[PDB]
Amino acid sequence: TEEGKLVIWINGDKGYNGLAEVGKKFEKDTGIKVTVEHPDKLEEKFPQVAATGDGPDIIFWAHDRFGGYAQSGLLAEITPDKAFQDKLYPFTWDAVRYNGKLIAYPIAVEALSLIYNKDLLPNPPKTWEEIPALDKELKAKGKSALMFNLQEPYFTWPLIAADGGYAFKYENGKYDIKDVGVDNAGAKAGLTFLVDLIKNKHMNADTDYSIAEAAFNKGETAMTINGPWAWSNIDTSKVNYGVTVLPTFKGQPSKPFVGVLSAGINAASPNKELAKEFLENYLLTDEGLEAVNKDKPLGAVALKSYEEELAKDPRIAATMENAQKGEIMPNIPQMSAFWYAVRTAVINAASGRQTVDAALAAAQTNAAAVKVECLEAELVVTVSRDLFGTGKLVQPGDLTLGSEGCQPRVSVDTDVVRFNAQLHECSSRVQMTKDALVYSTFLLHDPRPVSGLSILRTNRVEVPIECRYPR
Ligand SMILES: OC[C@H]1O[C@H](O[C@H]2[C@H](O)[C@@H](O)[C@@H](O)O[C@@H]2CO)[C@H](O)[C@@H](O)[C@@H]1O
Ligand SMILES: [Ca+2]
Ligand SMILES: [Ca+2]
Ligand SMILES: [Ca+2]
């Protein structure tokens, strides 16, 4: 990558100019230059480049991605002394722990909250069920009740999880990677409510992060749903806003996934010592975290000393209230499959392209059995041969990707079938969102002709396979 310097990747919604200021100070004292970059899809790009021995020295992301990276051998083990570990909260260290090793430095606790315009709405609704009626009133005076990012499942998940949706079942000291709670009655109820909001034109299916942000920050919508990072732009807009508890659904609290912003060190980095110095002695200090937080708020920082200093903030208090009512994300490798599954399900259900029941049923299978990798002109689909959980392995001839024109290369291992497919010939459907070009197809399992009576538990499965590329 290059010795004698530090390249850092952090997401574009985070305080990367502030992190760059911390890097400027590092360079002053040490002479080592620090380059902070915020590439798009960095959570997907990191493992691709790190596997070739390249990529940045340090990668920032929520903790949920790091178990996959660790499992893939992409991360150096971090070795802080007890004195440094004492400075941060135990819960945050827990988040960056994988298979008995610490695999990242924890930075800050994140959770979504309800953000609301006090002038347009002095009393924000305590329940989701209120919102359609509240929207009607606001529509009368040229406004909307609620706008938030409907393109990323992170933002819709709190509602889905409220009445009993979950990611993976934690049982007997581990997560069961085949027990996915995206297709239970609680999850269906949550998504159905969301899809109804769109049906009844209280929300729009195409609404994304930037649209929702512009709407609230211009005073066009009374509420939005976002994290601490979002506050800086609202402050600049001079909108009179409050950060509060997310609305309940069917009397139960919204359950946002708690994320811990984490910093991992590339296993291929020749600057592992410099990276440790930077993170421990420059970033993870009151002065370091202040520089980043000033840029874009981090939330509840992992560093005890600075967290206590900011805890008075009622916005942070609300973040932690919502964090309390939600669940911490697993960091297991299967989380990206889970996120793909839910992202796709919500988009297809919200568009009316698929039903809520059918969408979430497919999401279960995708999360449990499927991995989608989108490359330049190419697509890789890896399917678990234990497709149902029976222990009975599917045969590759019974699996089909796309239509007859789609002629992928098919490879078989003991446990998986792998499709290497050209996107042009295998795209059943293509479409454009504001931000993306979307290529879509389907994976089918159909063991026809089957040799008996078909009793139950249909062996016919079909799941959406989809790739999204930035416009
Ligand atoms: O939507 C799926 C996405 O959710 C999380 O990403 C969050 C992130 O944790 C926040 O810090 C902020 O940047 O918003 C992101 C959602 O757009 C998961 O951490 C991520 O793995 C997952 O893809
Ligand atoms: Ca992104
Ligand atoms: Ca299930
Ligand atoms: Ca700022």
Side-chain angles (χ1 to χ4, degrees), residues 92-109:
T92 66
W93 286 117
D94 288 356
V96 294
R97 198 170 268 121
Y98 187 73
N99 290 347
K101 286 175 172 171
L102 290 169
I103 65 185
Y105 286 93
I107 309 299
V109 183

Side-chain angles (χ1 to χ4, degrees), residues 176-376:
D176 184 0
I177 68 183
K178 301 295 178 177
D179 190 348
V180 193
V182 298
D183 66 317
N184 62 35
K188 295 189 183 168
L191 187 55
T192 295
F193 191 84
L194 180 65
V195 176
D196 285 352
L197 292 174
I198 301 168
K199 277 191 167 64
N200 304 131
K201 307 190 176 177
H202 304 306
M203 265 170 28
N204 178 250
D206 302 332
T207 298
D208 66 5
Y209 192 93
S210 68
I211 287 172
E213 182 177 35
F216 186 84
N217 293 5
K218 287 176 186 178
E220 300 172 340
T221 196
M223 298 181 288
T224 192
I225 293 175
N226 219 317
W229 58 84
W231 303 336
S232 189
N233 283 351
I234 310 179
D235 290 357
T236 313
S237 75
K238 265 67 194 176
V239 176
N240 186 26
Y241 76 97
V243 173
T244 186
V245 67
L246 291 166
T248 60
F249 178 61
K250 314 218 311 209
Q252 295 148 105
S254 292
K255 297 186 71 186
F257 264 132
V258 181
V260 178
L261 184 67
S262 305
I265 297 170
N266 197 324
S269 174
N271 305 304
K272 294 191 183 71
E273 302 93 320
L274 298 180
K276 171 169 180 168
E277 255 281 316
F278 176 78
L279 290 167
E280 293 192 0
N281 296 324
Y282 281 77
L283 178 52
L284 287 165
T285 60
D286 294 334
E287 310 90 53
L289 290 174
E290 177 175 15
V292 180
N293 192 77
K294 276 177 167 171
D295 186 3
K296 302 287 190 72
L298 285 163
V301 304
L303 190 72
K304 289 168 179 168
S305 64
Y306 196 57
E307 197 279 322
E308 289 175 44
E309 186 166 6
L310 270 40
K312 297 176 294 196
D313 196 331
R315 304 179 298 176
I316 303 301
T319 304
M320 292 310 304
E321 180 163 39
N322 283 311
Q324 228 68 6
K325 293 173 181 178
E327 221 70 58
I328 195 183
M329 292 183 289
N331 70 354
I332 60 170
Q334 293 77 21
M335 281 297 295
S336 59
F338 160 80
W339 283 125
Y340 165 86
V342 176
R343 188 214 314 153
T344 310
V346 172
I347 287 171
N348 287 349
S351 67
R353 201 158 29 253
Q354 187 61 277
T355 69
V356 169
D357 295 287
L360 288 175
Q364 151 73 48
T365 306
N366 267 335
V370 183
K371 283 185 297 196
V372 182
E373 192 171 11
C374 304
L375 308 167
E376 263 186 289

Side-chain angles (χ1 to χ4, degrees), residues 78-100:
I78 67 156
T79 57
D81 57 41
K82 186 67 158 44
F84 186 81
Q85 282 176 21
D86 286 351
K87 290 177 187 160
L88 317 192
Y89 289 107
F91 174 91
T92 66
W93 286 117
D94 288 356
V96 294
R97 198 170 268 121
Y98 187 73
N99 290 347

